[PDB]
Amino acid sequence: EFNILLATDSYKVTHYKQYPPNTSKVYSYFECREKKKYEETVFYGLQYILNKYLKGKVVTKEKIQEAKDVYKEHFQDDVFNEKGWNYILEKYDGHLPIEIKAVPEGFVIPRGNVLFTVENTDPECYWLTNWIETILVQSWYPITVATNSREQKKILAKYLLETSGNLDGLEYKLHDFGYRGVSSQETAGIGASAHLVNFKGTDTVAGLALIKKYYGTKDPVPGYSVPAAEHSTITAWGKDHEKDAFEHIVTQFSSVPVSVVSDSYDIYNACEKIWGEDLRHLIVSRSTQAPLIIRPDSGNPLDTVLKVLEILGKKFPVTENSKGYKLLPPYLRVIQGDGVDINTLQEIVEGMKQKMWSIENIAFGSGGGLLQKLTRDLLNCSFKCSYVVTNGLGINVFKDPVADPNKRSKKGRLSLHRTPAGNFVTLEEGKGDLEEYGQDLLHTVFKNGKVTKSYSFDEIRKNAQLNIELE
Amino acid sequence: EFNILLATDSYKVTHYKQYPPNTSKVYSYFECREKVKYEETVFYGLQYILNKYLKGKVVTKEKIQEAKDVYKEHFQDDVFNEKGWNYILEKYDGHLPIEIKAVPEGFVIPRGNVLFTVENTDPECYWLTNWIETILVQSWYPITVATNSREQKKILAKYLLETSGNLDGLEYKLHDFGYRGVSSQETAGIGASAHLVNFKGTDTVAGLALIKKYYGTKDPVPGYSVPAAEHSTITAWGKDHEKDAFEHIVTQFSSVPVSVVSDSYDIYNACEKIWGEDLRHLIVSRSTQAPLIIRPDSGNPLDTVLKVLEILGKKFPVTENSKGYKLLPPYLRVIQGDGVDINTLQEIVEGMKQKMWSIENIAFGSGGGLLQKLTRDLLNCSFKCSYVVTNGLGINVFKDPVADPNKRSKKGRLSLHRTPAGNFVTLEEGKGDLEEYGQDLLHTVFKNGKVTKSYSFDEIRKNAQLNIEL
Ligand SMILES: CC(=O)Nc1ccc(NC(=O)C2CC2)cc1
Ligand SMILES: CC(=O)Nc1ccc(NC(=O)C2CC2)cc1
């Protein structure tokens, strides 16, 4: 069973002996720090952490004893705020005396703005604000996945609109194949749910359950998939029988869309000879609601995609759309699911555009690039103390390392506001109290062990829409 | 509650309909495919997966119904193999009819060798082998952390041995600060445990419990930490009171080691004037068992370490060790916990060596670089079918993409062997049965719902030792 007393950076266990004596309040904030591109970030994932880990009776006698026993061996010393944890158990029935205020989930906010703040609601628990830094900072992950996923959506929308004249199917153009490429089951669910803020396609089922339990959607599920082969279901037929495997699978799945990996031995032979000749009669007969989707999975991603389209365009009837771009027949599409990240995604669609291929023709799958090849440094996700009260006097605190101005932190009590031009500004030093900038956009979401404001996944999706979708 | 019917890639739900008719056996294997350079990998972490997710009754009526309802909406179609899962429920009381063979955990094996194999033990459950690919493939993560952690130990060992003449304290030279920098609580525990294969220092508490539950150590805990400041415990005193903060903290922790972040405003001032002058009397009085450990945390990592050392060298009595390298007094050390990954670690220790500073003087902390900035591509961790039986005939299967020879997979039944020179070789096409290469080095670790062979964390550590330690 999860124990919040064991869910912090070890050294934090020792911090109740380090703050200035007579400190009644520690107030800290989280930002995606500006770095001297990722100019705006989707705020998502806090509500999961609040419900799964922080809410309700999270302290018990047994949990305190367990922690005491572990830390004694871990430190080879007795340092551990047993009294402090007892106080929360006795006075608040194990509920964290903490208030967290946050921007609504789904909101898209420029770098360098306060996204949430944390403070203790009882003077005795001044040490608790930063105890829970470790667990709260892990919000960097769904924030970064949602943000990086949204940025790939911008690229797709731009090129889809240019080559086709509309955005139809945009929400299916980047599929999550990341289940096997992430570091754990829990990461898989969190990461999949963050991708679903922006798209509807995922093969990692864990994302669905998480969304239902922690956020909720009107639709039965937030995510979808279609029948698809892997290399094992082709190669199991034997090297001389790829055609047989192909024929079997497309016939099994004759009325739904079907993805078939085509590069087991020779992707170009498979497209030109097998699909394009031997089995062409099983492809051209297919419904528009059930195309064959050809899946290359090796080689230079751009070069392979172009050569695959070139091959197919000579074997199947291609049309030219109203924008001047070439379009495969509706029963035939391509998915590139190898080597895809935000950099290569851009290179592929631009390369397709150069060769006059509509983005209508293709969709993308991303695994490690989508859910694993990301770090806290990408958006400089960071949690810092900005305000303390000591001897009843509030003081604005901050770091400002001489060798790195980029690591300077904000001062005092913070608030987030709309500017007169409609942008965002973070006010420091309690200047929000002057009320010159309209309402603070941060809302209380957690207070004294209870979740006080929640968002549905439908609202979050609405908040995270692209401008191009809006327009 | 975790449901293994829902812990696969969505598309694998439809695979029982895609294999050749009358297939009775699917046999697959995992390798770190040969292409840095990461020539050898530590095999670690399968035992966690076996126990937490695969063993015992993993199928119930409720889990079957649950997955049915989920997949119906997910595919917008009824495609779930309800009958197959019911067969396992009814026949084997929900225990998986699967056999897994694996190299011992902690083993250091060159790239391109079979590390584990998977096959169904019941003909009806031919589809089961690749259903669990997704869960088993996540072993890439502990393998890669452990391997990358060990590669850094190799670097530290070389430079420590060169500058000091021994390896004393090596196991504490790379400390895990990755708890906040990983993608989840579960990942934190797994990765920390993998780091602990090589080192004893971690602030990621979750690692200890994982090891205790799934592996076990003779000692009460496998990892240790020491009291340390963060920016909030320095800055909370106010910008004009950094000295007061330093004095309070080193006085509170006067007889244990204490790490004190010193770059809140001006690292160089902090070292030269605050520590080196104002509070010097509180530092030179400390025990060898309780040093002050000064922690810079910003600026170019190499330049910052070198300047911090030059500053301290002029304020405190420096000795020259037997190898001719400079050594701070035993009550004073440094930890660099910013910008550290396998690349910069190398640059820092080489830079220290060039300036005649012993590696004894320093330790490193790494977070995202240690536990998060790694992918399945680093070691090319990959799971592939190599052998099937269809119509009673065994077939050696494989992929071999024309535009990428690096993606070619192995053929047939596999086994791992010791060569005449004492190295590892993987034999394909069932050739291990010819008995020209001695016994198979893989062991059966899982069979029909039971873990059949396991390793303590102490055994794993021993297996993973560096040659220089041996
Ligand atoms: C629009 C589209 O192409 N969707 C789509 C295509 C393929 C897959 N799935 C696969 O290709 C799996 C085998 C990897 C999922 C959605
Ligand atoms: C040998 C050594 O220097 N160990 C060591 C030093 C510092 C810390 N911990 C910290 O510096 C925490 C503040 C980040 C842990 C172990």
Side-chain angles (χ1 to χ4, degrees), chain A residues 11-12 19 130 180 183-184 187 203 230 232 264 338 400 407, chain B residues 10-12 19 130 180 183-184 187 203 230 232 264 297 400:
Chain A
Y11 61 81
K12 288 172 174 290
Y19 283 107
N130 273 41
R180 83 189 57 175
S183 45
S184 65
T187 288
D203 277 22
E230 65 183 28
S232 83
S264 298
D338 173 71
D400 184 13
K407 290 186 165 181
Chain B
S10 289
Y11 64 89
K12 290 168 167 296
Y19 289 110
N130 278 38
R180 80 189 56 181
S183 49
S184 65
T187 289
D203 268 44
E230 66 179 29
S232 78
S264 298
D297 191 50
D400 189 15

PDB file of all heavy atoms in Angstrom, chain A residues 11-12 19 130 180 183-184 187 203 230 232 264 338 400 407, chain B residues 10-12 19 130 180 183-184 187 203 230 232 264 297 400:
ATOM      1  N   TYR A  11      16.419  13.293   1.262  1.00  0.00           N
ATOM      2  CA  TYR A  11      16.974  14.435   1.986  1.00  0.00           C
ATOM      3  C   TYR A  11      15.906  15.348   2.610  1.00  0.00           C
ATOM      4  O   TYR A  11      16.162  16.022   3.612  1.00  0.00           O
ATOM      5  CB  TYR A  11      17.938  15.230   1.100  1.00  0.00           C
ATOM      6  CG  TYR A  11      17.338  15.834  -0.152  1.00  0.00           C
ATOM      7  CD1 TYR A  11      16.637  17.018  -0.100  1.00  0.00           C
ATOM      8  CD2 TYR A  11      17.517  15.239  -1.393  1.00  0.00           C
ATOM      9  CE1 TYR A  11      16.107  17.581  -1.243  1.00  0.00           C
ATOM     10  CE2 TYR A  11      16.988  15.789  -2.538  1.00  0.00           C
ATOM     11  CZ  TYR A  11      16.286  16.969  -2.454  1.00  0.00           C
ATOM     12  OH  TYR A  11      15.757  17.539  -3.587  1.00  0.00           O
ATOM     13  N   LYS A  12      14.714  15.357   2.020  1.00  0.00           N
ATOM     14  CA  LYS A  12      13.605  16.176   2.517  1.00  0.00           C
ATOM     15  C   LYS A  12      13.153  15.749   3.915  1.00  0.00           C
ATOM     16  O   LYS A  12      12.556  16.532   4.655  1.00  0.00           O
ATOM     17  CB  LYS A  12      12.428  16.169   1.514  1.00  0.00           C
ATOM     18  CG  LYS A  12      12.714  16.986   0.242  1.00  0.00           C
ATOM     19  CD  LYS A  12      11.612  16.823  -0.846  1.00  0.00           C
ATOM     20  CE  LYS A  12      11.862  17.758  -2.045  1.00  0.00           C
ATOM     21  NZ  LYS A  12      11.655  19.206  -1.717  1.00  0.00           N
ATOM     22  N   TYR A  19      14.818  24.799   8.106  1.00  0.00           N
ATOM     23  CA  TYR A  19      14.133  26.063   7.848  1.00  0.00           C
ATOM     24  C   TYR A  19      14.400  26.990   9.027  1.00  0.00           C
ATOM     25  O   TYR A  19      14.751  26.514  10.099  1.00  0.00           O
ATOM     26  CB  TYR A  19      12.634  25.823   7.669  1.00  0.00           C
ATOM     27  CG  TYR A  19      12.292  25.249   6.315  1.00  0.00           C
ATOM     28  CD1 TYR A  19      11.915  23.924   6.175  1.00  0.00           C
ATOM     29  CD2 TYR A  19      12.361  26.041   5.175  1.00  0.00           C
ATOM     30  CE1 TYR A  19      11.611  23.388   4.912  1.00  0.00           C
ATOM     31  CE2 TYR A  19      12.059  25.526   3.912  1.00  0.00           C
ATOM     32  CZ  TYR A  19      11.683  24.204   3.790  1.00  0.00           C
ATOM     33  OH  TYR A  19      11.384  23.704   2.543  1.00  0.00           O
ATOM     34  N   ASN A 130       7.011  21.521   1.079  1.00  0.00           N
ATOM     35  CA  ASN A 130       8.073  21.024   0.226  1.00  0.00           C
ATOM     36  C   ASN A 130       8.344  19.526   0.363  1.00  0.00           C
ATOM     37  O   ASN A 130       9.003  18.944  -0.495  1.00  0.00           O
ATOM     38  CB  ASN A 130       9.337  21.882   0.346  1.00  0.00           C
ATOM     39  CG  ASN A 130       9.320  23.068  -0.615  1.00  0.00           C
ATOM     40  OD1 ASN A 130       8.289  23.716  -0.801  1.00  0.00           O
ATOM     41  ND2 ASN A 130      10.454  23.331  -1.253  1.00  0.00           N
ATOM     42  N   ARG A 180       5.024  -0.512 -24.961  1.00  0.00           N
ATOM     43  CA  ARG A 180       6.209  -1.321 -24.687  1.00  0.00           C
ATOM     44  C   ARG A 180       7.465  -0.474 -24.487  1.00  0.00           C
ATOM     45  O   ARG A 180       8.453  -0.953 -23.933  1.00  0.00           O
ATOM     46  CB  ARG A 180       6.458  -2.302 -25.824  1.00  0.00           C
ATOM     47  CG  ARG A 180       7.193  -1.676 -26.979  1.00  0.00           C
ATOM     48  CD  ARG A 180       7.223  -2.609 -28.154  1.00  0.00           C
ATOM     49  NE  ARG A 180       5.875  -3.001 -28.551  1.00  0.00           N
ATOM     50  CZ  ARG A 180       5.605  -3.738 -29.620  1.00  0.00           C
ATOM     51  NH1 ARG A 180       6.599  -4.157 -30.395  1.00  0.00           N
ATOM     52  NH2 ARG A 180       4.345  -4.052 -29.914  1.00  0.00           N
ATOM     53  N   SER A 183       8.724   3.154 -19.359  1.00  0.00           N
ATOM     54  CA  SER A 183       9.496   2.566 -18.278  1.00  0.00           C
ATOM     55  C   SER A 183       8.669   1.737 -17.289  1.00  0.00           C
ATOM     56  O   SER A 183       9.236   0.972 -16.493  1.00  0.00           O
ATOM     57  CB  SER A 183      10.247   3.678 -17.539  1.00  0.00           C
ATOM     58  OG  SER A 183       9.397   4.795 -17.299  1.00  0.00           O
ATOM     59  N   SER A 184       7.344   1.885 -17.322  1.00  0.00           N
ATOM     60  CA  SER A 184       6.480   1.121 -16.418  1.00  0.00           C
ATOM     61  C   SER A 184       5.023   1.090 -16.860  1.00  0.00           C
ATOM     62  O   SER A 184       4.593   1.913 -17.670  1.00  0.00           O
ATOM     63  CB  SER A 184       6.543   1.688 -14.993  1.00  0.00           C
ATOM     64  OG  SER A 184       6.022   3.003 -14.928  1.00  0.00           O
ATOM     65  N   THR A 187       3.479   4.567 -15.906  1.00  0.00           N
ATOM     66  CA  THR A 187       3.868   5.565 -16.882  1.00  0.00           C
ATOM     67  C   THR A 187       3.037   5.415 -18.156  1.00  0.00           C
ATOM     68  O   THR A 187       2.594   6.416 -18.741  1.00  0.00           O
ATOM     69  CB  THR A 187       5.367   5.481 -17.201  1.00  0.00           C
ATOM     70  OG1 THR A 187       6.114   5.977 -16.078  1.00  0.00           O
ATOM     71  CG2 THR A 187       5.696   6.321 -18.421  1.00  0.00           C
ATOM     72  N   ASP A 203      -2.926   2.511 -28.665  1.00  0.00           N
ATOM     73  CA  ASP A 203      -2.947   1.071 -28.455  1.00  0.00           C
ATOM     74  C   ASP A 203      -2.604   0.749 -27.018  1.00  0.00           C
ATOM     75  O   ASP A 203      -2.511  -0.413 -26.618  1.00  0.00           O
ATOM     76  CB  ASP A 203      -2.013   0.356 -29.432  1.00  0.00           C
ATOM     77  CG  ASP A 203      -2.662   0.125 -30.779  1.00  0.00           C
ATOM     78  OD1 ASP A 203      -3.622   0.840 -31.127  1.00  0.00           O
ATOM     79  OD2 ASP A 203      -2.223  -0.782 -31.498  1.00  0.00           O
ATOM     80  N   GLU A 230       1.400  -7.665 -36.598  1.00  0.00           N
ATOM     81  CA  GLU A 230       2.772  -7.369 -36.194  1.00  0.00           C
ATOM     82  C   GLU A 230       3.660  -8.299 -36.989  1.00  0.00           C
ATOM     83  O   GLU A 230       3.150  -9.137 -37.726  1.00  0.00           O
ATOM     84  CB  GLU A 230       2.972  -7.603 -34.692  1.00  0.00           C
ATOM     85  CG  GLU A 230       2.806  -9.062 -34.265  1.00  0.00           C
ATOM     86  CD  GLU A 230       2.948  -9.235 -32.760  1.00  0.00           C
ATOM     87  OE1 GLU A 230       2.644  -8.267 -32.040  1.00  0.00           O
ATOM     88  OE2 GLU A 230       3.365 -10.321 -32.298  1.00  0.00           O
ATOM     89  N   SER A 232       5.314 -10.853 -36.088  1.00  0.00           N
ATOM     90  CA  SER A 232       5.097 -12.261 -35.766  1.00  0.00           C
ATOM     91  C   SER A 232       3.928 -12.889 -36.547  1.00  0.00           C
ATOM     92  O   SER A 232       4.014 -14.052 -36.918  1.00  0.00           O
ATOM     93  CB  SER A 232       4.946 -12.492 -34.260  1.00  0.00           C
ATOM     94  OG  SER A 232       3.619 -12.243 -33.837  1.00  0.00           O
ATOM     95  N   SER A 264       8.583  -7.056 -43.547  1.00  0.00           N
ATOM     96  CA  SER A 264       9.253  -8.222 -42.953  1.00  0.00           C
ATOM     97  C   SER A 264      10.484  -8.669 -43.748  1.00  0.00           C
ATOM     98  O   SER A 264      11.531  -9.020 -43.168  1.00  0.00           O
ATOM     99  CB  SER A 264       8.284  -9.398 -42.812  1.00  0.00           C
ATOM    100  OG  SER A 264       7.211  -9.082 -41.948  1.00  0.00           O
ATOM    101  N   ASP A 338       7.565   3.932 -37.535  1.00  0.00           N
ATOM    102  CA  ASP A 338       8.944   3.726 -37.135  1.00  0.00           C
ATOM    103  C   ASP A 338       9.709   5.044 -37.183  1.00  0.00           C
ATOM    104  O   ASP A 338       9.578   5.815 -38.138  1.00  0.00           O
ATOM    105  CB  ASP A 338       9.609   2.697 -38.059  1.00  0.00           C
ATOM    106  CG  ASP A 338      11.099   2.551 -37.802  1.00  0.00           C
ATOM    107  OD1 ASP A 338      11.455   1.999 -36.749  1.00  0.00           O
ATOM    108  OD2 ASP A 338      11.912   2.963 -38.661  1.00  0.00           O
ATOM    109  N   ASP A 400      18.896  32.796  -7.341  1.00  0.00           N
ATOM    110  CA  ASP A 400      19.344  33.576  -8.492  1.00  0.00           C
ATOM    111  C   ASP A 400      20.834  33.327  -8.702  1.00  0.00           C
ATOM    112  O   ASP A 400      21.658  34.186  -8.409  1.00  0.00           O
ATOM    113  CB  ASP A 400      19.050  35.059  -8.245  1.00  0.00           C
ATOM    114  CG  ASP A 400      19.397  35.943  -9.426  1.00  0.00           C
ATOM    115  OD1 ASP A 400      19.636  35.423 -10.536  1.00  0.00           O
ATOM    116  OD2 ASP A 400      19.420  37.174  -9.230  1.00  0.00           O
ATOM    117  N   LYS A 407      18.082  30.222 -14.170  1.00  0.00           N
ATOM    118  CA  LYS A 407      17.584  29.471 -13.018  1.00  0.00           C
ATOM    119  C   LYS A 407      17.034  30.378 -11.915  1.00  0.00           C
ATOM    120  O   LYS A 407      16.645  29.896 -10.855  1.00  0.00           O
ATOM    121  CB  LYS A 407      18.666  28.533 -12.469  1.00  0.00           C
ATOM    122  CG  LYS A 407      18.994  27.360 -13.385  1.00  0.00           C
ATOM    123  CD  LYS A 407      19.965  26.403 -12.700  1.00  0.00           C
ATOM    124  CE  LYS A 407      20.044  25.053 -13.407  1.00  0.00           C
ATOM    125  NZ  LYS A 407      20.992  24.122 -12.709  1.00  0.00           N
TER     126      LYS A 407
ATOM    127  N   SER B  10      -3.136  -2.844 -27.889  1.00  0.00           N
ATOM    128  CA  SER B  10      -4.502  -3.066 -28.377  1.00  0.00           C
ATOM    129  C   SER B  10      -4.579  -4.044 -29.535  1.00  0.00           C
ATOM    130  O   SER B  10      -5.415  -4.942 -29.538  1.00  0.00           O
ATOM    131  CB  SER B  10      -5.154  -1.742 -28.804  1.00  0.00           C
ATOM    132  OG  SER B  10      -5.452  -0.943 -27.680  1.00  0.00           O
ATOM    133  N   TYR B  11      -3.694  -3.886 -30.509  1.00  0.00           N
ATOM    134  CA  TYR B  11      -3.776  -4.685 -31.724  1.00  0.00           C
ATOM    135  C   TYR B  11      -3.539  -6.181 -31.491  1.00  0.00           C
ATOM    136  O   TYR B  11      -4.040  -7.008 -32.247  1.00  0.00           O
ATOM    137  CB  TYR B  11      -2.848  -4.136 -32.804  1.00  0.00           C
ATOM    138  CG  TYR B  11      -1.371  -4.182 -32.494  1.00  0.00           C
ATOM    139  CD1 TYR B  11      -0.611  -5.290 -32.813  1.00  0.00           C
ATOM    140  CD2 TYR B  11      -0.727  -3.096 -31.928  1.00  0.00           C
ATOM    141  CE1 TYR B  11       0.736  -5.319 -32.557  1.00  0.00           C
ATOM    142  CE2 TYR B  11       0.618  -3.114 -31.666  1.00  0.00           C
ATOM    143  CZ  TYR B  11       1.344  -4.229 -31.977  1.00  0.00           C
ATOM    144  OH  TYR B  11       2.691  -4.252 -31.736  1.00  0.00           O
ATOM    145  N   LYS B  12      -2.808  -6.532 -30.432  1.00  0.00           N
ATOM    146  CA  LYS B  12      -2.548  -7.941 -30.146  1.00  0.00           C
ATOM    147  C   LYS B  12      -3.813  -8.695 -29.769  1.00  0.00           C
ATOM    148  O   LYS B  12      -3.833  -9.923 -29.775  1.00  0.00           O
ATOM    149  CB  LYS B  12      -1.483  -8.096 -29.047  1.00  0.00           C
ATOM    150  CG  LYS B  12      -0.096  -7.689 -29.501  1.00  0.00           C
ATOM    151  CD  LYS B  12       0.866  -7.574 -28.309  1.00  0.00           C
ATOM    152  CE  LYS B  12       2.315  -7.473 -28.786  1.00  0.00           C
ATOM    153  NZ  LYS B  12       2.755  -8.717 -29.497  1.00  0.00           N
ATOM    154  N   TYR B  19      -2.562 -15.719 -36.973  1.00  0.00           N
ATOM    155  CA  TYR B  19      -1.565 -16.776 -37.136  1.00  0.00           C
ATOM    156  C   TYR B  19      -2.081 -17.844 -38.100  1.00  0.00           C
ATOM    157  O   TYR B  19      -3.285 -17.958 -38.299  1.00  0.00           O
ATOM    158  CB  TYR B  19      -1.202 -17.402 -35.784  1.00  0.00           C
ATOM    159  CG  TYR B  19      -0.382 -16.480 -34.914  1.00  0.00           C
ATOM    160  CD1 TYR B  19      -0.926 -15.905 -33.772  1.00  0.00           C
ATOM    161  CD2 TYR B  19       0.942 -16.176 -35.241  1.00  0.00           C
ATOM    162  CE1 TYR B  19      -0.176 -15.048 -32.976  1.00  0.00           C
ATOM    163  CE2 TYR B  19       1.705 -15.319 -34.441  1.00  0.00           C
ATOM    164  CZ  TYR B  19       1.131 -14.758 -33.310  1.00  0.00           C
ATOM    165  OH  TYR B  19       1.863 -13.907 -32.498  1.00  0.00           O
ATOM    166  N   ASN B 130       2.824 -14.077 -27.582  1.00  0.00           N
ATOM    167  CA  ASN B 130       3.012 -12.682 -27.957  1.00  0.00           C
ATOM    168  C   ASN B 130       2.009 -11.701 -27.345  1.00  0.00           C
ATOM    169  O   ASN B 130       2.198 -10.504 -27.438  1.00  0.00           O
ATOM    170  CB  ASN B 130       3.150 -12.515 -29.476  1.00  0.00           C
ATOM    171  CG  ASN B 130       4.560 -12.796 -29.958  1.00  0.00           C
ATOM    172  OD1 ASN B 130       5.224 -13.707 -29.461  1.00  0.00           O
ATOM    173  ND2 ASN B 130       5.039 -11.993 -30.898  1.00  0.00           N
ATOM    174  N   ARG B 180      12.054  12.935  -8.715  1.00  0.00           N
ATOM    175  CA  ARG B 180      11.162  13.933  -9.296  1.00  0.00           C
ATOM    176  C   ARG B 180      11.230  13.960 -10.814  1.00  0.00           C
ATOM    177  O   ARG B 180      10.309  14.462 -11.469  1.00  0.00           O
ATOM    178  CB  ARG B 180      11.510  15.322  -8.784  1.00  0.00           C
ATOM    179  CG  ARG B 180      12.687  15.953  -9.500  1.00  0.00           C
ATOM    180  CD  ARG B 180      13.133  17.217  -8.823  1.00  0.00           C
ATOM    181  NE  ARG B 180      13.455  16.964  -7.424  1.00  0.00           N
ATOM    182  CZ  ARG B 180      13.854  17.901  -6.580  1.00  0.00           C
ATOM    183  NH1 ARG B 180      13.997  19.155  -7.000  1.00  0.00           N
ATOM    184  NH2 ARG B 180      14.113  17.575  -5.320  1.00  0.00           N
ATOM    185  N   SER B 183       8.939   9.535 -14.813  1.00  0.00           N
ATOM    186  CA  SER B 183       7.589   9.698 -15.337  1.00  0.00           C
ATOM    187  C   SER B 183       6.484   9.193 -14.404  1.00  0.00           C
ATOM    188  O   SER B 183       5.320   9.517 -14.596  1.00  0.00           O
ATOM    189  CB  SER B 183       7.484   9.048 -16.734  1.00  0.00           C
ATOM    190  OG  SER B 183       8.026   7.724 -16.745  1.00  0.00           O
ATOM    191  N   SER B 184       6.842   8.422 -13.381  1.00  0.00           N
ATOM    192  CA  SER B 184       5.848   7.981 -12.408  1.00  0.00           C
ATOM    193  C   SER B 184       6.476   7.384 -11.145  1.00  0.00           C
ATOM    194  O   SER B 184       7.672   7.119 -11.092  1.00  0.00           O
ATOM    195  CB  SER B 184       4.931   6.928 -13.026  1.00  0.00           C
ATOM    196  OG  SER B 184       5.678   5.760 -13.326  1.00  0.00           O
ATOM    197  N   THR B 187       7.888   3.827 -12.005  1.00  0.00           N
ATOM    198  CA  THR B 187       9.171   3.985 -12.669  1.00  0.00           C
ATOM    199  C   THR B 187      10.272   4.376 -11.673  1.00  0.00           C
ATOM    200  O   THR B 187      11.410   3.886 -11.762  1.00  0.00           O
ATOM    201  CB  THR B 187       9.072   5.031 -13.797  1.00  0.00           C
ATOM    202  OG1 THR B 187       8.301   4.486 -14.868  1.00  0.00           O
ATOM    203  CG2 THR B 187      10.454   5.393 -14.322  1.00  0.00           C
ATOM    204  N   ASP B 203      18.298   8.669  -3.216  1.00  0.00           N
ATOM    205  CA  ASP B 203      17.318   9.449  -2.471  1.00  0.00           C
ATOM    206  C   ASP B 203      15.920   9.057  -2.906  1.00  0.00           C
ATOM    207  O   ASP B 203      14.920   9.560  -2.400  1.00  0.00           O
ATOM    208  CB  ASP B 203      17.548  10.953  -2.638  1.00  0.00           C
ATOM    209  CG  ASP B 203      18.439  11.514  -1.549  1.00  0.00           C
ATOM    210  OD1 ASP B 203      19.459  10.889  -1.227  1.00  0.00           O
ATOM    211  OD2 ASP B 203      18.109  12.566  -0.979  1.00  0.00           O
ATOM    212  N   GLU B 230      18.268  21.885   0.442  1.00  0.00           N
ATOM    213  CA  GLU B 230      17.821  22.178  -0.917  1.00  0.00           C
ATOM    214  C   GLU B 230      17.752  23.687  -0.985  1.00  0.00           C
ATOM    215  O   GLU B 230      17.996  24.349   0.023  1.00  0.00           O
ATOM    216  CB  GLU B 230      16.457  21.557  -1.213  1.00  0.00           C
ATOM    217  CG  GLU B 230      15.298  22.127  -0.405  1.00  0.00           C
ATOM    218  CD  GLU B 230      13.968  21.461  -0.771  1.00  0.00           C
ATOM    219  OE1 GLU B 230      13.987  20.278  -1.171  1.00  0.00           O
ATOM    220  OE2 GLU B 230      12.915  22.119  -0.659  1.00  0.00           O
ATOM    221  N   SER B 232      15.222  25.724  -1.051  1.00  0.00           N
ATOM    222  CA  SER B 232      14.243  26.278  -0.101  1.00  0.00           C
ATOM    223  C   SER B 232      14.744  26.420   1.340  1.00  0.00           C
ATOM    224  O   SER B 232      14.331  27.343   2.035  1.00  0.00           O
ATOM    225  CB  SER B 232      12.916  25.508  -0.114  1.00  0.00           C
ATOM    226  OG  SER B 232      13.019  24.291   0.606  1.00  0.00           O
ATOM    227  N   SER B 264      22.838  29.257  -4.331  1.00  0.00           N
ATOM    228  CA  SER B 264      21.590  30.042  -4.315  1.00  0.00           C
ATOM    229  C   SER B 264      21.752  31.448  -4.910  1.00  0.00           C
ATOM    230  O   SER B 264      20.864  31.936  -5.603  1.00  0.00           O
ATOM    231  CB  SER B 264      20.996  30.156  -2.897  1.00  0.00           C
ATOM    232  OG  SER B 264      20.653  28.884  -2.359  1.00  0.00           O
ATOM    233  N   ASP B 297      25.396  23.710  -8.028  1.00  0.00           N
ATOM    234  CA  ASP B 297      24.209  23.212  -8.755  1.00  0.00           C
ATOM    235  C   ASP B 297      23.871  24.025 -10.013  1.00  0.00           C
ATOM    236  O   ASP B 297      22.731  24.000 -10.496  1.00  0.00           O
ATOM    237  CB  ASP B 297      22.987  23.206  -7.825  1.00  0.00           C
ATOM    238  CG  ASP B 297      21.797  22.448  -8.417  1.00  0.00           C
ATOM    239  OD1 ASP B 297      21.980  21.295  -8.864  1.00  0.00           O
ATOM    240  OD2 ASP B 297      20.691  23.012  -8.457  1.00  0.00           O
ATOM    241  N   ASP B 400      13.667  -9.813 -41.752  1.00  0.00           N
ATOM    242  CA  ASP B 400      14.938  -9.420 -42.345  1.00  0.00           C
ATOM    243  C   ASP B 400      14.701  -8.295 -43.340  1.00  0.00           C
ATOM    244  O   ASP B 400      14.822  -8.513 -44.545  1.00  0.00           O
ATOM    245  CB  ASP B 400      15.553 -10.629 -43.071  1.00  0.00           C
ATOM    246  CG  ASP B 400      16.994 -10.385 -43.541  1.00  0.00           C
ATOM    247  OD1 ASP B 400      17.642  -9.407 -43.087  1.00  0.00           O
ATOM    248  OD2 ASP B 400      17.481 -11.195 -44.364  1.00  0.00           O
TER     249      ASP B 400
END
